[PDB]
Amino acid sequence: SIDKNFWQGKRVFVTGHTGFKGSWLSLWLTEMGAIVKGYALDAPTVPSLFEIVRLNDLMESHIGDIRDFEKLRSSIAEFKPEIVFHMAAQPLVRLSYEQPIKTYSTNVMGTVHLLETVKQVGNIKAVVNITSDKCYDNREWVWGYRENEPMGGYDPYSNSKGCAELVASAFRNSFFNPANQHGVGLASVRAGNVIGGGDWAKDRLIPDILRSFENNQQVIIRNPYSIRPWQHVLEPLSGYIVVAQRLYTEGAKFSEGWNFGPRDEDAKTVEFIVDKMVTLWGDASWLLDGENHPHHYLKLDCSKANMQLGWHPRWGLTETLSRIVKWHKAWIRGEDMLICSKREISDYMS
Amino acid sequence: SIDKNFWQGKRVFVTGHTGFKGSWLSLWLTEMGAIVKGYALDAPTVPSLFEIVRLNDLMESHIGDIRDFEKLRSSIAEFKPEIVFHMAAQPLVRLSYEQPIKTYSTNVMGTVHLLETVKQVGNIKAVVNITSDKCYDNREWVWGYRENEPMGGYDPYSNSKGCAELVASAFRNSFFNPANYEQHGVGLASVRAGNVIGGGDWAKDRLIPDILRSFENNQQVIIRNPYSIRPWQHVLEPLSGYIVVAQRLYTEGAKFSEGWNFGPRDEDAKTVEFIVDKMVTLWGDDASWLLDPHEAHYLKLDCSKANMQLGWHPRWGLTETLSRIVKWHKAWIRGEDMLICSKREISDYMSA
Amino acid sequence: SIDKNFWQGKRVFVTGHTGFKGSWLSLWLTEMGAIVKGYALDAPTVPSLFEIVRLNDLMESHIGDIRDFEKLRSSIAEFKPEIVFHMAAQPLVRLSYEQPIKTYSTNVMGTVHLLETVKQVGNIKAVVNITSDKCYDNREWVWGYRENEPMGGYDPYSNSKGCAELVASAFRNSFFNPANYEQHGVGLASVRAGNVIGGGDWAKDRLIPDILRSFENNQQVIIRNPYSIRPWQHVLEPLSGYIVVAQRLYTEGAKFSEGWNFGPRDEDAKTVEFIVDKMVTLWGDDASWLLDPHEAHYLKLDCSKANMQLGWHPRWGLTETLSRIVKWHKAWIRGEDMLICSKREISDYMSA
Amino acid sequence: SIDKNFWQGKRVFVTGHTGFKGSWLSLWLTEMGAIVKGYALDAPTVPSLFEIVRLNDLMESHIGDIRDFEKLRSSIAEFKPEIVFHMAAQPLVRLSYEQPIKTYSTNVMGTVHLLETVKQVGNIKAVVNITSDKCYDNREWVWGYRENEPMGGYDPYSNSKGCAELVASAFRNSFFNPANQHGVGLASVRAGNVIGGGDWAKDRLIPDILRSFENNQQVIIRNPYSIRPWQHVLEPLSGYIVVAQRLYTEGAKFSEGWNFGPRDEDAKTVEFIVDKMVTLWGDASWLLDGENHPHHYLKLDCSKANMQLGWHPRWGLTETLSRIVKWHKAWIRGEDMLICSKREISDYMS
Numbered sequence A, D: 001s002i003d004k005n006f007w008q009g010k011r012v013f014v015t016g017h018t019g020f021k022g023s024w025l026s027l028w029l030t031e032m033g034a035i036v037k038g039y040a041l042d043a044p045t046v047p048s049l050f051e052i053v054r055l056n057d058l059m060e061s062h063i064g065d066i067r068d069f070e071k072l073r074s075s076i077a078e079f080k081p082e083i084v085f086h087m088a089a090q091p092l093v094r095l096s097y098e099q100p101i102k103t104y105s106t107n108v109m110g111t112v113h114l115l116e117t118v119k120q121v122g123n124i125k126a127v128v129n130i131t132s133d134k135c136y137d138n139r140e141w142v143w144g145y146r147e148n149e150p151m152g153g154y155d156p157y158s159n160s161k162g163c164a165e166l167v168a169s170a171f172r173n174s175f176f177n178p179a180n181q182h183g184v185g186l187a188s189v190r191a192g193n194v195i196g197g198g199d200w201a202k203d204r205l206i207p208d209i210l211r212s213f214e215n216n217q218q219v220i221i222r223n224p225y226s227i228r229p230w231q232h233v234l235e236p237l238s239g240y241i242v243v244a245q246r247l248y249t250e251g252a253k254f255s256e257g258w259n260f261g262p263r264d265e266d267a268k269t270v271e272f273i274v275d276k277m278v279t280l281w282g283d284a285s286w287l288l289d290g291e292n293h294p295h296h297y298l299k300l301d302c303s304k305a306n307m308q309l310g311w312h313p314r315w316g317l318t319e320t321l322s323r324i325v326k327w328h329k330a331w332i333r334g335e336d337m338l339i340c341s342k343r344e345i346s347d348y349m350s
Numbered sequence B, C: 001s002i003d004k005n006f007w008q009g010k011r012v013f014v015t016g017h018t019g020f021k022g023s024w025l026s027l028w029l030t031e032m033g034a035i036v037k038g039y040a041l042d043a044p045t046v047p048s049l050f051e052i053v054r055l056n057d058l059m060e061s062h063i064g065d066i067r068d069f070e071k072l073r074s075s076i077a078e079f080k081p082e083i084v085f086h087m088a089a090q091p092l093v094r095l096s097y098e099q100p101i102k103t104y105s106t107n108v109m110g111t112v113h114l115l116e117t118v119k120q121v122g123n124i125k126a127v128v129n130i131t132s133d134k135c136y137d138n139r140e141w142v143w144g145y146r147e148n149e150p151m152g153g154y155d156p157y158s159n160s161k162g163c164a165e166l167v168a169s170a171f172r173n174s175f176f177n178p179a180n181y182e183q184h185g186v187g188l189a190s191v192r193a194g195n196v197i198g199g200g201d202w203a204k205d206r207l208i209p210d211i212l213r214s215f216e217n218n219q220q221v222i223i224r225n226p227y228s229i230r231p232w233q234h235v236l237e238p239l240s241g242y243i244v245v246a247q248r249l250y251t252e253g254a255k256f257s258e259g260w261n262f263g264p265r266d267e268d269a270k271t272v273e274f275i276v277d278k279m280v281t282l283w284g285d286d287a288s289w290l291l292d293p294h295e296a297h298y299l300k301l302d303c304s305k306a307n308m309q310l311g312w313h314p315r316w317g318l319t320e321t322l323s324r325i326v327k328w329h330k331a332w333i334r335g336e337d338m339l340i341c342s343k344r345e346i347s348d349y350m351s352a
């Protein structure tokens, strides 16, 4: 499914390469022989996987704002990629509330900017627009969303993603009609609850837990019974890649929306998770706070990807966790993270 | 019904007051005793109703860009309105195809700005967000859309309205939540009108203006899609709907803080051809038309919610409406007093 | 439009011809020159229009049960009709609650029988399956249902129609497939009408009959649900729709072999109260009403498909309709010649 | 999830007990201590699991037609069950075409008959109405149906099931409103592609294959690439039981529709299946015919059951198959099938 030779030598432009996912993706792709260029603001964190693995060496990197159409246009045109991965985004919900303007301009205008650039420039066979599992109108039900369902979003962040999804659709219809020449294939990819090593995001369950353990402090669990479709970073990333390959060779036929996610079977509680974590950590412990600990959850239906891309996730919760834990320790102990990160990909690739 | 007394003295801020809808609204509103402050770019066209009726002299007209947050916020801040009508937009289809970015920035970020501005300023009781009949994902089918259907849009303009709809519901949810109404005091409604036609519209590529211009200049009008259908309606119709909701939001914010369609009666949802044929007839004196980028074929709106829930109904019929547009255009032509004609239409409507 | 010439000489088999709808249909049909054979149980009520207009003497009326397959099949077989209207049913709500089994057997198996009979007999060109406006899952909302919405039904009657709808589409799919049209030659449509009201209906618990009976006997009519809404329409309205489709199915079976709603214009979908108030007025002479098992509150039908696709539109308004029912009832009362009055209404409608 | 003690001593009335599923269910339930009564026509086949395991000994059995309301009413009233499983049905699609009247009267009128009886009689806490995965309006898509989707069915059999589903709904609304006393809890259960030992149905993939092998003849595979949500007979049956328990103790809250099915992950091709079969058989072989062998499939979304009943399937395709094969051999060799059948349940129960 993931063809190395395919990647070998491809001029790939990725927006938002300095962040978590962008860095894992850029790595992989370079690991594979692709000629990458990144366009983003400086690493969103400290530490930052981007830096930790010294990616500016392995790839061309442009620091810039998605909101500068011209600069953005320029940067791409100079490059002439053939493949584009769009991931620059203001990703926090929390923030989304304080900074709605920022969220929207970044998330919606940036998307518009990007597709319009791709449009004006020309010579792009494949664009993979990264949105979110939150783009969907939230019915607060037990069911996993299908790609044909309505967009929305309750908070600014989620809502911004539903808009980005509308944008990609209109761009596709207006400018890259599959039904017709331009040679541009455009897919919007949806996924969430992404976990792995290199995630220095603040107020994130995994990161937290790890910081906690690392600093020997015990963890306060706010809601033990909460369930999420937790998935290793590489899982969705593989979907994106494959999708990119398909868009490339097959075009139009895959120019559409696509959900990436774990098996329902693989859904664990926060409590379960922290427990495993603990065990996994060794050294590690946690506590239940005084808030309300309530007993449905947002999920995606992956039938279309399984079925039409033959895509399937590879690691089970436990494995992923351990791999997460192991990668953290390595880091902490001063191991070469580029290498370990590399093996991580390698392993997933088997 | 519209309440002239409710309007008296009200501080009303209207974005996009320089346009077709804006001008008619501002005129209506000032005529009712309201204190209106507009914020838009210079008149979209020439001629322009704004200019034609000298509205600038009957209101506080401020020239500015919706994309300039800071400037927008200030404008609002200094006036402290109690009511707001957000109508500024790049409202054209074919153009949106040519200028995608300006369309989205204007329509989308402009809405965000306006709503963020409303949030920061405070003491605003009612917010009426004007979107479009094009916000709905178009299934190209025989049925009028319901408020509960999915947002979308094929072209950048349609799609930008779809996004504007999403934006308002997220602001509503996160910041003007009916739950915490007492905490914010904000009523916010998204209003979706049909295809407004009336005397005083110079917009490019629109049907009636197109028609009026050709007729005027003893030329035949060029028809691109004779069998398309739109929810045709006198410009004053949805305006009445907008006004009514503002009234209701003023006192029962929580309750009417949602989406509303304002369109004609189903029988008024005719084809392009029908209109042009009628218009030819209405004009007379040689009038003729002639047959010639993705546009929707069918577009209808189901208005049972406003009918039942707001108890709002349309006043004029398509034919009556066409007749009135003609009369208006000609009067203008003969150099009649348009402010006076325009005032007359509002009054007649109020009587209808 | 209805085609009197198309009708002439046609062998038409009508199940449930003894009823209200049936009688009006049979009358219409024979009046057009058609050769009608009915198959139903004895008149549903007394009085009965069937009896009142002596239809039995103007057609081949056969008394039989839809649940008796063999008997039904035979009846059809011996007549070899070219057209079929399936209207036999236990059509009442409250009753269905009391008699669930008879309701389902009649409505469901009766449809199966009829369709299986049509299959075995052959040479039938058009089949018009009358279901009900109650076939749709009722979401209790402001919107008229579209042909493409889900079937359901809360009570046994509603639900039996939902099942009757499913049955016809499965027969269509499996046995009268548009694909193999040339192989079977069968056109089959499911028609969903509104709430028919007209002179000549004695059905139990129905509104207008209820009203007419009380008025008649200088008593007040007892109203159970004043604010409910139904798609009120003169009985001749949907009939026209049924007739029109049969015409079309006759020659373009494949093409019109689907579901169709036949209802009034949206403005005619008023409440119970409105009707009774109007009726009081129409009747006069002391007329009054008085306020008093699960029934739907709101029920409307979206008819854009028939409007656009069959080009069918309703002729009379609710008020006109109410007026005509009154006139009819009274004439009857004074001992006027009902066949003649009834013939007159059909003619007037044909003129409308 | 399946409580033995619960079952112990329950007066349970099952319609369609002589057939495949009815016999497995009746067994289990008796295995568990329930006092069962069956109401059905004579065994639909030869051999017949019903006979093979000598069920008339283990349970009360009434031979009768579902279409005789009175008799049916009588039979239940005499019994006073507290739990009712409704499974009498004309189950063949093939037949459904030749015998539409039969199918409908049986499938729809029988259902009406049954619910009305339950109604008139009284004293039934739980009714489990067995429909089919085919009750749904078939959208010919990749997605698994949700319980809230529209009913229909293309052929008479499928369509008959969509009607039965409408019937149960109306009965529930009209007569057993959850929202209100009567103490009747009514669930409609949907499932299909049910496989296992004891299935003597003609023109059924598994049965066939087994007959074939058994008679040393080689098998002709019409469509190798076809995919179905194949599941061991006991899988759905467990759902039914549990559902029954819930309806019983909790009532109304579970008075609704429910889908039972396998994990998507567990979807195999006919070819795959026959291969495994072969291997599994030993002795065994097959051939591809001359028809068209084409490359979406009807499936159900089981989120509601997983989530709200905590229900999950237990055996994987392979296992099920083997168990199928093993049970067949046992039979053939003259082993006591009641016993083996018994162990089958026992095993599933672990």
Ligand SMILES: Nc1ncnc2c1ncn2[C@@H]1O[C@H](COP(=O)(O)OP(=O)(O)OC[C@H]2O[C@@H](O)[C@H](O)[C@@H]2O)[C@@H](O)[C@H]1O
Residues within 6 Å of the ligand: A015, A016, A017, A018, A019, A020, A021, A022, A039, A040, A041, A042, A043, A044, A064, A065, A066, A067, A087, A088, A089, A090, A091, A106, A130, A131, A132
């Ligand atoms: N205005 C901007 N211009 C350019 N790049 C930007 C801008 N704002 C943010 N970015 C870049 O976007 C990335 C954000 O990365 P993270 O905070 O690590 O978030 P990540 O988990 O990578 O999220 C990427 C985005 O796509 C979805 O996968 C995800 O949910 C999120 O919304 C970084 O490359 C960051 O510099």
Ligand SMILES: Nc1ncnc2c1ncn2[C@@H]1O[C@H](COP(=O)(O)OP(=O)(O)OC[C@H]2O[C@@H](O)[C@H](O)[C@@H]2O)[C@@H](O)[C@H]1O
Residues within 6 Å of the ligand: B015, B016, B017, B018, B019, B020, B021, B022, B039, B040, B041, B042, B043, B044, B064, B065, B066, B067, B086, B087, B088, B089, B090, B091, B106, B110, B130, B131, B132, B203
């Ligand atoms: N960036 C901008 N900043 C401020 N005002 C703007 C901007 N872009 C457009 N406007 C203002 O928007 C108005 C547009 O008016 P018209 O072109 O006449 O369009 P109209 O038919 O009045 O549309 C009014 C409103 O109703 C909706 O149907 C339509 O989308 C628009 O939102 C004018 O006052 C114009 O200056």
Ligand SMILES: Nc1ncnc2c1ncn2[C@@H]1O[C@H](COP(=O)(O)OP(=O)(O)OC[C@H]2O[C@@H](O)[C@H](O)[C@@H]2O)[C@@H](O)[C@H]1O
Residues within 6 Å of the ligand: C015, C016, C017, C018, C019, C020, C021, C022, C039, C040, C041, C042, C043, C044, C064, C065, C066, C067, C086, C087, C088, C089, C090, C091, C106, C110, C130, C131, C132, C203
């Ligand atoms: N088992 C039966 N066998 C044969 N005919 C039957 C049977 N049950 C009822 N009928 C016939 O059905 C007809 C019912 O007529 P009405 O009670 O007057 O009802 P009407 O208002 O005419 O309904 C006609 C049709 O339109 C639908 O709205 C309604 O459900 C029915 O299908 C009568 O001719 C009656 O004898």
Ligand SMILES: Nc1ncnc2c1ncn2[C@@H]1O[C@H](COP(=O)(O)OP(=O)(O)OC[C@H]2O[C@@H](O)[C@H](O)[C@@H]2O)[C@@H](O)[C@H]1O
Residues within 6 Å of the ligand: D015, D016, D017, D018, D019, D020, D021, D022, D039, D040, D041, D042, D043, D044, D064, D065, D066, D067, D087, D088, D089, D090, D091, D106, D130, D131, D132
């Ligand atoms: N008219 C009838 N009256 C009574 N019982 C009947 C009647 N017709 C069929 N049955 C009984 O129904 C059962 C049919 O069993 P099978 O042919 O083995 O089919 P099975 O796989 O058990 O299917 C049961 C039914 O429910 C669903 O699970 C399934 O898809 C099928 O429609 C037997 O008990 C049979 O005697």
Ligand SMILES: Nc1ccn([C@@H]2O[C@H](COP(=O)(O)OP(=O)(O)O[C@H]3OC[C@@H](O)[C@H](O)[C@H]3O)[C@@H](O)[C@H]2O)c(=O)n1
Residues within 6 Å of the ligand: B091, B092, B093, B131, B132, B133, B134, B194, B195, B196, B205, B206, B207, B208, B210, B222, B223, B224, B225, B226, B228, B229, B230, B272, B295, B296, B297
């Ligand atoms: N010469 C011409 C002109 C027009 N036409 C056809 O008439 C119809 C109406 O088009 P317009 O008047 O431009 O209105 P729009 O419906 O695009 O959007 C309008 O109504 C909805 C609002 O939201 C939007 O802002 C406003 O521009 C279309 O099918 C168009 O192709 C034709 O066939 N020949």
Ligand SMILES: Nc1ccn([C@@H]2O[C@H](COP(=O)(O)OP(=O)(O)O[C@H]3OC[C@@H](O)[C@H](O)[C@H]3O)[C@@H](O)[C@H]2O)c(=O)n1
Residues within 6 Å of the ligand: C091, C092, C093, C131, C132, C133, C134, C194, C195, C196, C205, C206, C207, C208, C210, C222, C223, C224, C225, C226, C228, C229, C230, C272, C295, C296, C297
């Ligand atoms: N005294 C009375 C009588 C009636 N009503 C109300 O008037 C409405 C109309 O009821 P009915 O005339 O009985 O018509 P139905 O709509 O039940 O079905 C009818 O129309 C649809 C057809 O399919 C069906 O066969 C036919 O019976 C209901 O809300 C009823 O409760 C009231 O408030 N007081």
